[PDB]
Amino acid sequence: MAVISMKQLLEAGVHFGHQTRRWNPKMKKYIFTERNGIYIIDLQKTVKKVDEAYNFLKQVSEDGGQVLFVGTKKQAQESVKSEAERAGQFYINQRWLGGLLTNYKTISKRIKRISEIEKMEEDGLFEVLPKKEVVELKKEYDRLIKFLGGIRDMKSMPQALFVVDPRKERNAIAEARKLNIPIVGIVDTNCDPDEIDYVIPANDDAIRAVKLLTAKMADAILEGQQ
Amino acid sequence: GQKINPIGLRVGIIRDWEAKWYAEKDFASLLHEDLKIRKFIDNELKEASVSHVEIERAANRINIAIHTGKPGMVIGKGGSEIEKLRNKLNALTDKKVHINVIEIKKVDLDARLVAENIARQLENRASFRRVQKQAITRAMKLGAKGIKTQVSGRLGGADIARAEQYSEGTVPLHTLRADIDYAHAEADTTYGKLGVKVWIYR
Amino acid sequence: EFEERVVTINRVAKVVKGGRRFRFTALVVVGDKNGRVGFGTGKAQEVPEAIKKAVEAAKKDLVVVPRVEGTTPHTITGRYGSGSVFMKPAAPGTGVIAGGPVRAVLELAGITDILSKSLGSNTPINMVRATIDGLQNLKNAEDVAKLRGKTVEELY
RNA sequence: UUGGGCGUAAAGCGCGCGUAGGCGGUUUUUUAAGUCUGAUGUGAAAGCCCACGGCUCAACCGUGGAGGGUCAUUGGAAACU
RNA sequence: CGAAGGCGACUUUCUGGUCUGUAACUGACGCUGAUGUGCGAAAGCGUGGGGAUCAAACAGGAUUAGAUACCCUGGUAGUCCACGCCGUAAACGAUGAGUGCUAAGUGUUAGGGGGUUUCCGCCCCUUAGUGCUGCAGCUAACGCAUUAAGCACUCCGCCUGG
RNA sequence: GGUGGUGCAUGGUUGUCGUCAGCUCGUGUCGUGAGAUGUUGGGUUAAGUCCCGCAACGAGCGCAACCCUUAAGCUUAGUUG
Incomplete structure (x- = not known):
């Protein structure tokens, strides 16, 4: 709904950071106490930030906002991709290719290159090609949807943003501070909250922090659409 | 550039024959009569931007096939300027009869079509950019991918020759079954000659 | 109307084992005569794209210059790197007296009642940066009294 | 001064210690000296504020206060010196 | 540790001085630092131990196309030290000296602080430092960033084309 | 008429480096700029010939056979062979 309530909040692992010198x-404001180096959220602000983001994802989808989602790290290949399908949104699975959004008139073509080379090998006149090409037509195919399987139905601009973590996706919020995209991520410590708009300091080993927040967060773009 | 002629790279590999006749026996005499009518054939067209020629010999029917890229001036009015070359056909040699003509739409798509033309756009020496910038940019607007045409021999008035090319795109100029036509002209400027090597594409 | 002003043409020669390039870069200033001013450049070759990609580059960022009208409201300056500009407000019936990078952002915002003591460097990059980085740091009277928490008309 | 630098560009002796000099922590009270004001006199003739008069225009000469708003004759105020 | 030139088998003599901790006390008793006084590395002007080793200068052998050069020793003062200095070094942390303030981690030298304990060892507070990485700010950039070239104050000295 | 002169007025034009395999462009991004990334780290190879992983993607030129042919086949006509 809105919150992770206080039973499955202190027993799941959504009240954890990690150690000093891997510390931001x-x-x-997101430090409550040290738990053998692991810090704790103040677990009311992380909701009051995210419950208005829930309303912000609601009114942005009230103007049809495709709130972009990203799960790229090896904890998020089945966390944010597992949630954006419960959220009906456009995920991201693989790494920052170098101009998917800033140069979005050449690397969004890779969705068109996976909507045209699909259209190549779907209908007729696919058979006459040399079969060594169809090796690398299909090697082009798998690489194209390893990255942009979420942006398949997203032939529009991303209006808002959801990242998993800016430690290994720091260029995502760099894009979100270059093209003015509102961003919200379940960050851990040693991640900067300044460039992000809605920070949730989550340890990156709880998919319950993903399953009780981020599917339901852009459920407020599926219900926030209407 | 220490290379060979690229129009030689596809003689009989990709291209067809512009000489598809058969003259085996007594080849010596009836060859000199081909080039005795040939040395005036080009000078009477008055820089017509001809593409090339395809001579045919068949039981003494040495028929002339000149293109003359600008039409009309070879026909006349229903056989008035065509009979004059037909009259010289019976005048230089015995018969040589029945001269023909063709024309070309998309007026700068062939190789020698441009090469005779952009040579003649270099005697005046006025806007060697913009006339070729009219040529090459409209050529891809006429259906081209990579067209490569240079202005070589002693531009500007200088005592040193400066080549000035314009080329881009995908240009497989050395593959065996690709039809590449290539040219050369002798537009002198009373200090040096403009040998122009053209390249076009589709 | 995003008002254009060009600065220069250019040629850059990267001497290598082979040959040097003929890149024709530029830099422009793009204002609007409203107090919403940008500037742009680009490593281009086309004199149109010297404008066009840079007009696009200036429309990556139009900075908000608050204008209490008739002039620039204060006696201000500029700052970037090795260069710095200066502006003193003055009469309207003067005729604008400034330079190349110090006039540029000052003329494409319609103010016309200013001075110019262009101190600092002669490199126009950090100069027109200082012409912009000073000008973006301008503030009006009504927002600051809102920011301080006084009233607007209490400041005189 | 307004309105410059001293690591590699010119700008720290080889370091000191030290004589003079300059400049000095913190918190209370006296003077009005320094500060800052108020009553006047009040600062120069071509030069210098503003407006006319004399020059055919003008070049070139007077007018009317402004007038000193800086110095003196004078009253003061203590945070800061 | 010493201001710096510097300081090395030690046992002892006389000491300097560093530092921590408690902070008892005087009630800012301070900093720069022109003058002045010192030190002042090495070599050089000389004395007595010096020529044991090393070694300018000199010597020898050949190499090498070229010697006595790169190779080699013998060997003179100079060396070593004490006895007089001269007043010079990349004497450079190429950063004058005293005081406030702004991201960190990381060892290490001395004193105080402990928790367990350890069979003298684990973890951690602090001081003064010794070091290594690293924000904001900085510069032309290098690079600096608590052992600032960042943000402020005071004094001296120096500089303004070669 | 020139072989009379002049490759250096020059069109060319070849040999060489050279089997050398290297050589270029558009969009990103980063740099105050001078400029850098796509051809690379791991494993596999006769040469921009691979795949993973790489701030990259797109665009190339030469790139192997494609052209001629060895040989190993089939098919045609038995032709003067």
Whole structure:
């Protein structure tokens, strides 16, 4: 719904950070206490940030907003991709290709290159090609949807953003601070909250932090559409 | 550039024959009569931007096939300018009869079509950019992919020759079954000659 | 209307084992005569794309210059790197007296009652940066009294 | 001064210690000296504010206060010196 | 550790000085630092131990196309030290000296602080430092960033084309 | 008429490096710029010939046979062979 309530919040693992010197020093609002180096959220602000983001994802989808989702790290290949299908949105699975959004008139073509080379090998006149080409027509195929299987039905611009973690996707929020995209991520410590708009300091080993938040977060773009 | 002629790279591999006749026996005499009528054949067209020629010999029917890229000036009015070359056909040699003509739409798509033309756009020496910028940009607007045409021999008035090319795209100029036509002209400027090597594509 | 002003043409020669290039870059200033001013450049070759990609580059960022009208409201300056500009507000019936990078952002916002003591460098990049980085740091009277928490008319 | 630098570009002796000099922590009270104001006199003739008069225009000469708003004759105010 | 030139088998003599901790006390008793006084590395002007080793200068053998050069020793003062200095070094952390403030981690030298304990060892507070990485700010950039070239104050000295 | 002169007025035009396999462009991005990324780290190879992983993707030129032919086949006509 809105919150992770106080039973499955302190027993799941959504009240954890990790240690000092893998620490971001501007997480002082997101530091409650040290638990053998692991810090705790103040678990009311992370909801009040995210419950208005829930309403922000609602009114942005009230103007039809395709709130972009990203799950790229090896914890998020079945966390945010497992949630954006419960959220009906456009995920992201693989890495920042170098101009998917800033140069979005050449690397969004890879969805068109997977909507045209699908259209090549769907209908007729696919058979006459040399079969060594169809090796690398299909090698082009699998690489194209390893990355942009979420942006398949997203032939529009991303209006808002959801990342998993800016430690290994720091260029995502760099795009979100270049093209003015509102961004919300379930970050851990040693991640900067300044470039992100709605930070949730989650340890990156709880898919319950993904399953009780991020599917339901862009459920407020499926219900926020109407 | 220390290379060979690219129009030689596809003689009989990709291209067809512009000489498809058969003259085996007594080849010596009836060859000199081909080039005795040939040395005036080009000068009477008055830079017509001809593409090439395809001579045919068949039981003494040495028929002339000149293209003359600008039409009309070879026909006349229903056989008035065509009879004059037919009169010289019976005048230089015995018969040589029945001269023909063709024309070309998309007026700068062939190789020698441009090469005789952009040579003649270099005697005046006025806007060697913009006339070729009219040529090459409209050529891809006429259906081309990579067209490569240079202005070589002593531009500007200088005592040193400066080549000035324009080329881009995908250009497989050395494959065996590709039809590549290539040219050369002798537009002198009373200090040096403009040998122009053209390349076009489709 | 995003008002254009060009600065220069260029040629850059990267001497290598082979040959040097003929890149024709530029840099322009693009204002609007409203207090919403940008500037742009680009490593281009086409004199149109020297404008066009840079007009696109200036429309990556039009900075918000608050204009209390008639002039620039204060006696201000600029700052970037090795260069710095200066502006003193003055009369309207003067005729604008400034330079190349110090006039540029000052003329494409319609103000016309200013000065120019272009101190600092002569490189127009950090100069027109200082012409912009100073000008973006301008503030009006009504927002600051809102920011301070006084009233607007209490400041005189 | 307004309105410059001293690591590699010119700008720290080889370091000191030290004589003079300059400049000095913190918190209370006296003077009005320094500060800042108020009553006047009040600062120069072609030069110098503003407006006319004399020059055919003008070049070139007077007018009317402004007038000193800086110095003196004068009253003061203590945070800061 | 020493201001710096610097300081090395030690046992002892006389000491300097560093530092921590408790902070008892005087009630800012401070900093720069022109003058002045010192030190002042090496070599050089000389004395007595010096020529044991090393070694300018000199010597020898050949190499090498070229010697006595790169190879080699013998060997002179100079060396070593004490006895007089001269007043010079990339004496450079190429950063004058005293005081406030702004992201960190990381070892290590001395004192105080402990928790367990350890069979003298684990973890951690602090001081003064010794080091290594690394924000904001900085510069032309290098690079600096608590052992600032960042943000402020005071004094001296120096500089303004070769 | 020139072989009379002049490759250096020059069109060409070849040999060489050279089997050398290297050589270029558009969009990103980053740099105050001078400029860098796509051809690369791991494993596999006769040469921009691979795949993974790579701030990259797109666009190339030469790139192997494609052209001629060895040989190993089939099919045609038995033709003067």
